Design a protein around this ligand. Structure first.
Ligand SMILES: CCC/C=C\C/C=C\CCCCCCCc1cccc(O)c1O
Lengths: 270, 98
């Protein structure tokens, strides 16, 4: 559980850019920046947290001016910083513990530690030169420290409360079986699909009765448009050994009633 | 440092001919963020496909979810077509269903 902001800035040439900004409570997107209207977009009714409209207006004003300042600053010093177009700047900041990190061309470049920007030693002279430009105003850095140490912890706790009915919901998975498309000769690939579950932690194994089949290969947990998760678990078996196999799913929402499906019927085929 | 996209295609529910469902294409681990993703039905582009806001992982690589509501039939084939600077030719990943 951690509140963080994701900032993506693409500088294709001196006269063209694209800025994308979003707020996150771990895997959950809670806010978006509208590049057109230059306003905060609340994705949930509880996204406003325990903060007021006046407090939100000042936060909005601070973000709007710092982005115009950032794009102009990077444009002005791109040559001295040895930034060659097209390039991308990524920033992530928040609290878990507090952090604020910046990448250039998808690699660690600089980070904010305590009250100043520190270069990543590997990023070399460019990153030292960037920190010189970023640390020009100490008052601006003190504002950054206070946002990370004071404003951020106050926001995350006051958000986890307002969104409690959402983050703690239990959504039951559904599962199904299919044939895998790339098996070897004399072998089959059995696939167990698990979808629609929330929260993310899940257990899925191919079984032979009570024996877990350790050839079970679990893929990545993938997102669904509705906020639930998906996972596929595959098992490579010899064609004459797919008998009595089942896929078993355990999830917090099921309260001990595991889902069990059997490699049977037209999948065998009988 | 350029990173090629990983592309995973899946449905929200088991495939049932004539029942409404969601087709997903999760594209991840790529750099730079410029990417073209299309959902295909019988090799033709599906219009008005939705996508998640662009985000990135701890290693700074980007990820997106593309999705669309659809109704599969016995004769239809679906895929995800991705274009990126790291690919000499577009990569087509099929939706596997029994
Ligand atoms: C002149 C060079 C500047 C280069 C990089 C710094 C540019 C932007 C920092 C992005 C970090 C965003 C963290 C918080 C963003 C935010 C989100 C919601 C509300 C806000 O008021 C806000 O500032």
């Amino acid at each position: 559980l951690s509140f963080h902001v994701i900032w993506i800035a693409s500088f294709y040439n001196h006269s063209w850019k694209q800025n994308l900004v979003s707020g996150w409570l771990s895997d959950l997107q809670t806010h978006t920046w509208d590049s057109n209207s230059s306003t905060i977009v609340f994705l949930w009714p509880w996204s406003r947290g325990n903060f007021s409209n006046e407090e939100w207006k000042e936060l909005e004003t601070l973000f709007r001016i710092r982005t115009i300042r950032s794009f102009e600053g990077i444009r002005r010093y791109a040559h001295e910083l040895q930034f060659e177009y097209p390039f991308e700047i990524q920033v992530t900041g928040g609290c878990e513990g507090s952090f604020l990190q910046l990448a250039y061309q998808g690699s660690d470049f600089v980070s904010f530690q305590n009250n100043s920007w520190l270069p990543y030693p590997v990023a070399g002279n460019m990153a030292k030169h960037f920190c010189k430009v970023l640390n020009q105003n100490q008052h601006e850095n003190d504002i950054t420290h206070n946002l990370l140490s004071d404003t951020c912890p106050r926001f995350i706790l006051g958000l986890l409360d307002a969104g409690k009915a959402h983050l703690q919901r239990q959504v039951k998975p559904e599962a199904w079986l299919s044939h895998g498309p790339s098996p070897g000769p004399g072998h089959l690939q059995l696939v167990c699909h698990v979808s629609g579950f929330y929260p993310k932690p899940v257990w899925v194994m191919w079984m032979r009765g009570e024996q877990e089949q350790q050839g079970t290969q679990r893929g990545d947990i993938l997102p669904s448009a509705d906020g639930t998760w998906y996972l596929r678990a595959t098992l490579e078996v010899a064609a004459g050994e797919a008998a009595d196999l089942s896929c078993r799913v355990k999830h917090s929402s099921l309260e001990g009633q595991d889902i069990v499906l059997y490699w049977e019927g037209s999948l065998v085929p009988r | 440092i350029q990173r090629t996209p990983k592309i995973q295609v899946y449905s929200r529910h088991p495939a049932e001919n004539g029942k409404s469902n969601f087709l997903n294409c999760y594209v991840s681990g790529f750099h730079p963020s410029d990417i073209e993703v299309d959902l295909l039905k019988n090799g033709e582009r599906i219009e008005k496909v939705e996508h998640s806001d662009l985000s990135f992982s701890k290693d700074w690589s980007f990820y997106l979810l593309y999705y669309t509501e659809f109704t599969p039939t016995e004769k239809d084939e679906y895929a995800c077509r991705v274009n990126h600077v790291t690919l000499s030719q577009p990569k087509i990943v099929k939706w596997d269903r029994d």
